[PDB]
Amino acid sequence: KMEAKIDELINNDPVWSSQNESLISKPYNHILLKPGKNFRLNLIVQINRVMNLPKDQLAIVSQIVELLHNSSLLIDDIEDNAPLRRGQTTSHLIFGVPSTINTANYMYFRAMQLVSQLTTKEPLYHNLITIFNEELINLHRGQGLDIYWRDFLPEIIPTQEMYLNMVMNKTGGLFRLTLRLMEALSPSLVPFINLLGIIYQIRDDYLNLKDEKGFAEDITEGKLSFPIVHALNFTKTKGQTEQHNEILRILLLRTSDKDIKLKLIQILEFDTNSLAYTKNFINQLVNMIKND
């Protein structure tokens, strides 16, 4: 009797009830509650004017990008110890870091599974899987560097050039993934999508300081954001020792003190002019398209 139950278990595919699906989906369902700006989704609709994928294929590509985007935020908020995401408590503080890590990773592989419902043309299929794998590798390479510079500061002080190659991997990754899949499926805008990704990341960095995640949470997180990279390299270059050191000291506190965060922003505004430099840099990238 014990034997037959073991036999039945080992001789059949692993069983998975919808009740269990609901238990381990909690972390992800929570983040779905507040949709974001849907910038990537709208980007997908627009781009389809030229690519012309059938409604059904397009829905799958959208689902894949939404799964990857949202799960990547679940992981990034654990990796940054972020208290808020889209104005609500982050999933890992509600369900725990362990379940949130496993759920986000599980969703990466469900996104992978959807890639098969895109086609049966073995030539195409292979190319699709390859695009997915390459860009998931690129995403993790960039995320890995961003995380390393932040957690081991001041071991490595990146240069503007180093930051830009990191963003090409980290932020450029899902934008290139989306576009490469759609382009592969069309009955090249990658360079434009790379620039768009760089502008998106630097702008996010800029706005987090200029201005829901909390007041300037990138400082509390110790991030080597575009403005900070400019500030540290500017102070190094000009021999501004006291301030170079104060920028590093503040980043290392991982502080939520609102006055210390503003102190740091004012050093960028008045001592290194890092805010004006970043605002200008963004406009210079945007003009490359406006002047195309």
Ligand X SMILES: CC(C)=CCC/C(C)=C/CC/C(C)=C/CC/C(C)=C/COP(=O)(O)OP(=O)(O)O
Closest to ligand X by CB, 76 or 246: 76
**Nearby residues of 53 by Cβ (< 8 Å), 6 or more positions away:** 61, 182, 185, 186, 187
Q: With CB under 6 A as the rule, give the number of residues binding ligand X.
A: 21
CB of 33 closer than 8 Å to CB of 85: no
Buried/exposed 202-216: b ≥16 CB within 10 Å, e otherwise: bbebbebbeeebeeb
Q: Helix, strand or coil for residue 88? A: strand
Task: Decide whether 40 or 271 has the Cβ nearer to ligand X.
Answer: 40
**Which residues are documented as binding site?**
37, 40, 69, 76, 80, 85-86, 170-171, 201, 208, 213, 223
Nearer to a copy of itself, 45 or 190 (CB): 190
Which of 103, 201, 220, 225 contacts ligand X by CB under 6 A?
201
List the interface residues with ligand X, window 5-24 (CB under 6 A). Answer: none
Integer Cα distance of 277 and 20 in angstroms: 51
Using the minimum distance from each CB to a copy of itself, give the nearer residue, 21 or 212: 21
Tokens in use for 277? 């430099």
The one-letter amino acid code at 213 reads K
Tell me: does residue 103 bind ligand X (CB under 6 A).
Answer: no
Nearest to 31 by CA among 92, 105, 102: 92
* Partner interacting with residue 36 (select from ligand X, a copy of itself, none; CB below 5-8 Å by kind): ligand X
**What is the rounded CA–CA span in Å between residue 226 and residue 281?**
10
Q: Which option in a copy of itself, ligand X, none does residue 10 bind, with CB closer than 5 to 8 A by kind?
A: a copy of itself
Cα end-to-end span (Å), the chain: 75
Cβ proximity to a copy of itself, 143 vs 278, nearer residue: 143
- Which amino acid type is present at position 200? Y
Of the candidate spans 8-16, 69-77, 219-227, 242-250, the one that interacts with ligand X by CB under 6 A turns out to be 69-77
Does 72 sit near ligand X (CB under 6 A)?
yes
Distance between CA atoms of residues 253 and 159, nearest Å: 22
Select the span of 20-28, 71-79, 157-165, 246-254 touching ligand X (CB under 6 A): 71-79
User: What three-state secondary structure class fits 85?
Assistant: strand
Residues in CB range of 285: below 8 A, 6 or more apart? 195, 198, 199, 202
- When CB distances are held under 5 to 8 angstroms depending on the partner's kind, the choice from ligand X, a copy of itself, none that residue 37 binds is ligand X
Residue 37 makes contact with ligand X by CB under 6 A: yes
Report the binding-site residues for Mg(2+).
76, 80
- Binding flag, residue 209, ligand X (CB under 6 A): no
**Is there binding between residue 96 and ligand X (CB under 6 A)?**
no
At residue 33, what are phi and psi to the nearest 5 degrees?
Answer: -50, -45
Beta carbons within 8 Å of 257's beta carbon, 6+ residues apart: none
**How far is Cα 33 from Cα 35, in angstroms, rounded to an integer?**
6
Q: Which does 186 bind (CB under 5 to 8 A by kind): a copy of itself, ligand X, none?
A: none
CA separation for the pair 41, 220 (Å, rounded): 30
Q: Extract the annotated binding site for isopentenyl diphosphate.
A: 37, 40, 69, 86
Residue 100 interacting with ligand X (CB under 6 A): no
Nearer to ligand X, 100 or 235 (CB): 100
| Residues of the shown chain interacting with ligand X in the complex, contacts defined by CB under 6 A | 36-37, 39, 68, 71-73, 75-76, 86, 108, 136, 139-140, 143, 170-171, 174, 200-201, 204
